[PDB]
Every structure is written in structure tokens, then in C-alpha cells.
């Protein structure tokens, strides 16, 4: 399945705060979260203060991914509304982040390959002396 496209949709109503983007957005990376609201309504900003989401498509730029998943969590939990978010680099490149494969990570979905899964109980990790002078950790085996 192909990821969601990212157009220029209007941003929520807000008078502006001091909790928004900084130089990190300019030099390193920032983030963008989009959602579709049934009506105009008030929501609390992750960066502090109250804003108004418009009806239809909404696009909000945040400084951290955690802020994005926080806002999105509040959207899905309180306003019963689906959301997505991407990471954006200064060169213009956009990386689709969440939800990765179109399905929320809470519920299982075929197609996902395991990462960092050790097929052994945690107590069966080797002692540090077993990995001395190697680059390996007892949990990397």
C-alpha cells in the first residue's frame, strides 16, 4: 500500500505562542501532522495554549515527533478522528512516519518483519565477560 500524500492544507486557528518552532526546524528537521475534522472546534496545543481546528483538512507543523503523536493521540481519543504525520528535512524532503503501514501498531498486521526480537527468555543473556573485548552486548545476541 502507498503512503499518504502531503499537500498544502490550511492550518488551525491560533494567535501564536512561544512554544512553536525554533532553529532546529530550519537546520535539522521538523514535523507535520494532518487530520480531518467534522467541524470547527477547540483543542489544546501540545506546545501550550488553545487553538481551533477547522472543518475538513488540517495541517500543523510541530518541532518533535512526540508532540505529533501526543496531539494525534488526543485527537483519536477525544475527537474520534484519524490523523497522520510526517518528518520534514530542510532540503524539502518529506518522510512519512505514522501510521507506518496504514494500520495502528497496537493491532497486529501482516507484513511487518521483526526487529530486535530475541527468541530466548531475558534471564538467559550471557554475562558481560562473555562479550569482553568484542563490540557485542549480551542483548545483541
Amino acid at each position: 500500500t502507498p503512503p499518504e500524500l502531503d499537500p498544502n492544507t490550511p492550518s488551525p486557528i491560533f494567535g501564536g505562542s512561544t512554544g512553536g518552532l525554533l532553529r532546529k526546524a530550519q537546520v535539522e528537521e521538523f514535523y507535520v501532522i494532518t487530520w480531518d475534522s467534522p467541524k470547527e472546534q477547540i483543542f489544546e496545543m501540545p506546545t501550550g495554549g488553545a487553538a481551533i481546528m477547522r472543518e475538513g483538512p488540517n495541517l500543523l507543523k510541530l518541532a518533535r515527533k512526540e508532540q505529533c503523536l501526543a496531539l494525534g493521540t488526543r485527537l483519536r481519543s477525544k475527537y474520534k478522528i484519524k490523523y497522520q504525520f510526517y518528518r520534514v528535512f530542510p532540503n524539502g524532503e518529506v518522510q512519512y512516519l505514522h501510521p507506518k503501514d496504514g494500520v495502528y501498531p497496537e493491532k497486529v498486521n501482516a507484513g511487518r518483519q521483526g526487529v530486535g526480537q530475541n527468541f530466548r527468555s531475558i534471564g538467559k543473556n550471557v554475562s558481560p565477560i562473555e562479550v569482553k573485548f568484542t563490540g557485542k552486548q549480551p542483548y545483541d545476541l
Binding site: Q41, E44, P46, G49, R64, A70
Partner: protein
């Protein structure tokens, strides 16, 4: 339509809930699996918000709770009066206030504690009290132990009535939410009925009982020989002998010839030379005027008739270009959230207790109070502490509102939102001003210490080197001293002797009050005060403004008001909760108040208190060393702490020995807090694992699994023992010092 709204029998009265610990919480009611349960039971006992979502039930709970508190206080007053009647030297003290030490506690003779019953005078052996009850009782016109007994009985009765009122207004007739929400009516009744009629009727007691009996006492007549208070009401001839105005009855009052009442309603100011206290005539007039003011003030808000303001209207009327909607929405917030109210009221009540401390030192309202240095020092310190604590509480509950009750989707306010939108600027600015203040106050002290150590006193900041005069405060002093002649013609003297100009009031050979000089040292300490207060504000305000979210923790609000952290991630997020900000703010409040009470103690012992010789030679307790000694940390270390701790450290074998014991005990508890503050519960849990093993080996392991305290409780225990320790230390120090050299 403001009216009496009440539900009948909301809760059945039964001991069934008494036999079920933690009934208020579904979690705690299930019982203990670990020992943690126990602590929780006490931690959430009065957190009614975590009990129910219903604002009404919470409101009822707080109402009856308040009744319980008032009951306790009445029982306390009852105790004080009863001990003043049965176990004291009060009458003897009345006979000779200047050479008898106030005592109203005696100890039983076991294990040698009998030594605590010291020679307080009046042919009595006991513990010298510093609460100041004797001067109050003298001011109220009380002369016998019988009257104290009667007041005790009255207070006990009132305790019963308050308790019954609690039970009644919780179990039998519990007010509706609309009733509690009638804020216009509550404000009216509290302004006019409580304060107004309070000071009015008190002015009644003062004019009919206090003034005459005190006039007699001051005349010198034996207390037993003084006419009983009821006689001054029955026989107007006596009052007429004392104040001829009463010969014309209440006629000059209604005929607007108020000038005729200048006999007992004066406006002299200053202090009565033969008592060292404010003029009781001035006090009676004060309470009368205050009564009028509050009485008319209690008719401001609209209730059941057209006249009167609406709070919401006044709020919604105030909105500017900088603030947009202004104070709109605040009425709804302040009529649905107990925590916001508690915040405001704690801040203001604390501030009030502070102003009470200052005003009571500088304008002694009770007879023979200013020369009872022990009592004055005690009162100042006490009320200062109470104030600081209440203020920190204001921060706590502000934050608690911020987490639990704030909801911008249903109860929005523009001012709060705008505050939240530039919180970074506010906190950063407070930060900077704190660093600046710290440098330019403490740095002056370190500068002085260094110059003094290097043999360069001419390079210090002092009155004899680089001067830093409190010009503004000096100007205010001069202005207030010259006021009686210019801007307050009807006033005879100044409102306080402490102003830059004036004479000197002494009683019984001791200095009551004199003009307080302000120099470089005072500039220094005042800026220290500004610094410490600013830091405390920084911590607390940062705590409440970032209680909901930060760039670090975007969803902090969901973690609650009180939680240890959000893990070692993000570099480490310990103490991010607003509760932890209350926790740090407590330490800083302790710091500030400590340096404040040290300031008061040293200044009073150095430039004010002391004995006065004939021809006017004043010898102060520490001989005016403040101006030269308080400009270095070493000066406080040696001339204040080291020098004055003498009395406490050699108090053994005397009646003041309990203060030595408490000195050591407080030091101990203080150090003991550091174990909790410096450590963490993981270590303690593992140690507990080993000990539990040992208990299992001998079949004595408890079913309620021994658990280390939570992180938060570790912090709470820490700060509690820290405060108790430090404060009790300064307590013992102060009391032993001032009782021995006073």
C-alpha cells in the same frame, strides 16, 4: 433567586465505614497487598477530587471538614484559656507586668522534668509562654481567673456546636451546589456580617469593657479592686467619670455631634508612654471605622433585589487591546473549581499573615507587648512561617487546578491562555532577574568577605567605605515622620516610632520602640529578600505554568499533578511534575523565611531592643553591631549564630534545658531528612529484599509485603523532616536566646 437549598439525609450515619479503611477509594477499599497501601490511605484521605467527580458532594465534604477545623480551633482556644486560668501566674503578672515572666504551662514531677518548672515570678514555677495571651487578656479587660474559666467553657461549648454543625450539614441537611455557588451573597454576608459586625461588636466590647478597665489598670489600682465590667454598663456614672462623653448618652451620635466623642475615640497615633502599646482609644475608633467600611462594602453585590453589581458583569467589562477578551470566563472558573479558589485565598491569606507580622512588630497593639521581646520575636517568626507555607500552598493548588480542572474547550479564559502562550518569556525573564539579583546581592557579601579577609576594609560595601544607602526607604521614613504636621493634620504623633524621626518609647526601663536607622546593611538584606522571594516565585510559577505540557514532555498533564517523573529518557526527567516544584519551592521558602527572621532578630537585638538608663542612655542587647557585622557572611557566622547560640548551648541544668534538647533533636531530624533526599528507593528495596529473606527464614514474614517508600513519598518525607528540623532548630535558638538575654 438566591435562597436556602438543602438535601435531606444524603448520607446515613453508620460506623460501618469506620471498620473499612480506605472506603472513599475503590482501589484502597480492597485492602493491602503491600505496605504501600497504608501510606496511600493517608495521602488521598482529603483529596476529595479523586473520590468523586460530583462537585456537590465534594463541596459538602469540604463544608463539614471546615466545621471540623473550627471545632478543633475552638477546643484549642478553650485549652489556652483554661490553662491561663488554672495553671498560670496571670493575676500576679497583672500586678507586675514589667518584672514577671508570662507562664501558663506546668509539668508533672517525674524523671527529673520538674526542672522545667522555672522561676517565672509571681511565686509561681513553670514554663514561660511566648504566645502573648496575657497581653491580650489584659487588653480585653480580663482581671480574674474566673473570667478565663468562663471563656474556656464558652469555647468548649462552641467546639461542640461546630462539631455538631459539621455532622448536621453533612448527614442531615447538606447544602446544594447552587447554594455554595451563590458567591455574590457569600461575599455580601462575609463582608458585612462577618468582618463588619465582628469589628463593630468588638468595638462595643472595647468601648464598654476594655477602655475603662484598662484606664483603671494604668491608673495603678489593684485589679481585684477594679469594678467588674458589667458595672460599667449598668452604672454609666463610672464611664462618665472616665469619659464625660457618656454623660450625653448616644445623643451626640444621632445628632451628628461626633466631636463630643473625642474622649474615647481619638486619632493620636504612636504608642501610649505608660504601656508601650497603641492607644486603646485609637484602636476602638479604628474598629468602629472599619466596621462602617465593611458594612457598606457588604452591600455591593446583587442578590434578591435589583440593586447591586454582578461579578460576571464587572469581569466581562474589563478587556483591553493587549488582552483581548480580558477577564471573561473567570467567573465560571471561580464558581466550579475549589482549587482555584484555594490558590487565591492561600496566596492572599499568607500575604496577610506576613503583613500582620510586620505591622505587629512596628505597631504593638497590646499593652506590655513591645517590652516582652520573647513574645514579639516569637510572634513575628511564627506568622512569617505560617505566611510562607500558605503561599507555597497557593502555588500547589494553582497547579492542581491547572492539571485537573482547566478545560479550554468548555471553560475558556483569554488571560490564562495568553499567559500560557508566552510562558517561555515569563519564566526566562524570571530566571534572568533571579541570576542578576543573586549576583548583585550575595555577590556583595562575598565581595565584602574577600576584601575584609585581604585587609582591605576600605574596599567593602558599607557605611564606612563604598556606601549603598537605602535613599528611597529613608525618604519614605522621613515623609511618614513629618506626616502628622502636613498630610495628616488630625494625627498627633506618627503611626509608628520606627519612622526616621521621633522620640523614644520605653516601659519599665526597657526600650519599647525607637526610630529604626537604615543603612548599607539594610540595603543588602532587603535585596537578599527580593532575591530569595524571586527565586521561590520562579520555581513555583514555572511549576504551575508548565504543569500541563513542555517541549520535553508534551503530554505531562495526562501524568497528573503528582508523579515522580517520566523516566530516565530524554536525558532524564526527574521532578518534572508541578508537585516536585512545590517540593523545591518549599526548600526555597524555608531559605527566604530563615534569612528574614534572622534579619528581624539581629536588627531588633542590635538597633532597637535593650535597656535604657536615666538621662536617656540606651544600651542595646548587641550594641549596634549590625551595621558593621551583617555585611559579611563571617559576621553572621560569628556575631549572630556563634555568639547568640550561647544561651541555647549552655541551657542545660536550667528551666531552658528543653530548648537545648530541642536544638539537638532538630539538628538530628534535619540531618535525618538528608538520607531520604539524597537517596533512591531501589537501594532500599533490595536491602528490604535481604531483610525479608531473614524474616522468611524464621517464619516471621508479614503478609503485607514490606515495600520501600515511593519516590514521591521519599521526597515528601525528606522535605518534611528537613523543614521540621531546620525550623525547630531556629525555634530553640530564638526562644533560648531571647528568654535568657531578654
Amino acid at each position: 433567586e438566591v435562597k436556602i437549598l438543602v438535601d435531606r439525609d444524603p448520607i446515613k450515619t453508620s460506623f460501618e465505614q469506620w471498620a473499612k479503611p480506605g472506603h472513599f477509594s475503590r482501589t484502597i477499599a480492597k485492602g493491602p497487598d503491600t505496605t504501600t497501601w497504608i501510606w496511600n490511605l493517608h495521602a488521598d484521605a482529603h483529596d476529595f477530587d479523586s473520590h468523586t467527580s460530583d462537585l456537590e458532594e465534594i463541596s459538602r465534604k469540604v463544608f463539614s471538614a471546615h466545621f471540623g477545623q473550627l471545632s478543633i480551633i475552638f477546643l484549642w482556644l478553650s485549652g489556652m484559656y483554661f490553662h491561663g486560668a488554672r495553671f498560670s501566674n496571670y493575676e500576679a503578672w497583672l500586678n507586675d507586668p514589667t518584672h514577671i515572666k508570662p507562664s501558663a504551662q506546668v509539668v508533672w514531677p517525674i524523671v527529673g522534668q520538674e526542672i522545667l518548672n522555672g522561676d517565672v515570678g509571681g511565686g509561681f514555677r513553670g514554663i514561660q509562654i511566648t504566645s502573648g495571651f496575657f497581653q491580650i487578656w489584659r487588653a480585653s479587660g480580663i482581671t480574674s481567673e474566673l473570667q478565663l474559666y468562663c471563656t474556656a467553657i464558652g469555647a468548649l461549648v462552641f467546639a461542640g456546636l461546630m462539631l455538631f454543625a459539621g455532622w448536621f450539614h453533612y448527614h442531615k441537611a447538606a447544602p446544594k451546589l447552587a447554594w455554595f455557588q451563590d458567591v455574590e451573597s457569600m461575599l455580601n454576608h462575609h463582608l458585612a456580617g462577618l468582618l463588619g459586625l465582628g469589628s463593630l461588636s468588638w468595638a462595643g466590647h472595647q468601648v464598654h469593657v476594655s477602655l475603662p478597665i484598662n484606664q483603671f489598670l494604668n491608673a495603678g489600682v489593684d485589679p481585684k479592686e477594679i469594678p467588674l465590667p458589667h458595672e460599667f454598663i449598668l452604672n454609666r456614672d463610672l464611664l462618665a467619670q472616665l469619659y464625660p462623653s457618656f454623660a450625653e448618652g448616644a445623643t451626640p451620635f444621632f445628632t451628628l455631634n461626633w466631636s463630643k466623642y473625642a474622649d474615647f475615640l481619638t486619632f493620636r497615633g504612636g504608642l501610649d508612654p505608660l504601656t508601650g502599646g497603641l492607644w486603646l482609644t485609637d484602636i476602638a475608633h479604628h474598629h468602629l471605622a472599619i466596621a462602617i467600611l465593611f458594612l457598606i462594602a457588604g452591600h455591593m453585590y446583587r442578590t434578591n433585589w435589583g440593586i447591586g453589581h454582578g461579578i460576571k458583569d464587572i469581569l466581562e467589562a474589563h478587556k483591553g487591546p493587549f488582552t483581548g477578551q480580558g477577564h471573561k470566563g473567570l467567573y465560571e472558573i471561580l464558581t466550579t473549581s475549589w482549587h482555584a479558589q484555594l490558590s487565591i485565598n492561600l496566596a492572599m491569606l499568607g500575604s496577610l499573615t506576613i503583613v500582620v507580622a510586620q505591622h505587629m512588630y512596628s505597631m504593638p497593639p497590646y499593652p506590655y507587648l513591645a517590652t516582652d521581646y520573647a513574645t514579639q520575636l516569637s510572634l513575628f517568626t511564627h506568622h512569617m512561617w505560617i505566611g510562607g507555607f500558605l503561599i507555597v500552598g497557593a502555588a500547589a493548588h494553582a497547579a492542581i487546578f491547572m492539571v485537573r480542572d482547566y478545560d479550554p474547550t468548555t471553560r475558556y479564559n483569554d488571560l490564562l491562555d495568553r499567559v500560557l502562550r508566552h510562558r517561555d518569556a515569563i519564566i526566562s525573564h524570571l530566571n534572568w532577574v533571579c541570576i542578576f539579583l543573586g549576583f548583585h546581592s550575595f555577590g556583595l557579601y562575598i565581595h565584602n568577605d574577600t576584601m575584609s579577609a585581604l585587609g582591605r576594609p576600605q574596599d567593602m560595601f558599607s557605611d564606612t567605605a563604598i556606601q549603598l544607602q537605602p535613599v528611597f526607604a529613608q525618604w519614605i521614613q522621613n515623609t511618614h515622620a513629618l506626616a502628622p504636621g502636613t498630610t495628616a493634620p488630625g494625627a498627633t504623633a506618627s503611626t509608628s516610632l520606627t519612622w526616621g524621626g521621633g522620640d523614644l518609647v520605653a516601659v519599665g526601663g526597657k526600650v519599647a520602640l525607637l526610630p529604626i536607622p537604615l543603612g548599607t546593611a539594610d540595603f543588602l538584606v532587603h535585596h537578599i529578600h527580593a532575591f530569595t522571594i524571586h527565586v521561590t516565585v520562579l520555581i513555583l510559577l514555572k511549576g504551575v505554568l508548565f504543569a500541563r505540557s513542555s517541549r520535553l514532555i508534551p503530554d505531562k498533564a495526562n501524568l497528573g499533578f503528582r508523579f515522580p517523573c517520566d523516566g530516565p529518557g530524554r536525558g532524564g526527567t526527574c521532578q518534572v511534575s508541578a508537585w516536585d516544584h512545590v517540593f523545591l519551592g518549599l526548600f526555597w521558602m524555608y531559605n527566604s523565611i530563615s534569612v528574614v527572621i534572622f534579619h528581624f532578630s539581629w536588627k531588633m537585638q542590635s538597633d532597637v531592643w535593650g535597656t535604657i538608663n536615666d538621662q536617656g542612655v540606651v544600651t542595646h542587647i548587641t550594641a549596634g553591631n549590625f551595621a558593621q557585622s551583617s555585611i559579611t557572611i563571617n559576621g553572621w557566622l560569628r556575631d549572630f549564630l556563634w555568639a547568640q547560640a550561647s544561651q541555647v548551648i549552655q541551657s542545660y541544668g536550667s528551666s531552658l534545658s528543653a530548648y537545648g534538647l530541642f536544638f539537638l533533636g532538630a539538628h538530628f531530624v534535619w540531618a535525618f531528612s538528608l538520607m531520604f533526599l539524597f537517596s533512591g528507593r531501589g537501594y532500599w528495596q533490595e536491602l528490604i529484599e535481604s531483610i525479608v529473606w531473614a524474616h522468611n527464614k524464621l517464619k516471621v514474614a508479614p503478609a503485607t509485603q514490606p515495600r520501600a517508600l515511593s519516590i514521591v513519598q521519599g521526597r515528601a518525607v525528606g522535605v518534611t523532616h528537613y523543614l521540621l528540623g531546620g525550623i525547630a532548630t531556629t525555634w530553640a535558638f530564638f526562644l533560648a536566646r531571647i528568654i535568657a538575654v531578654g
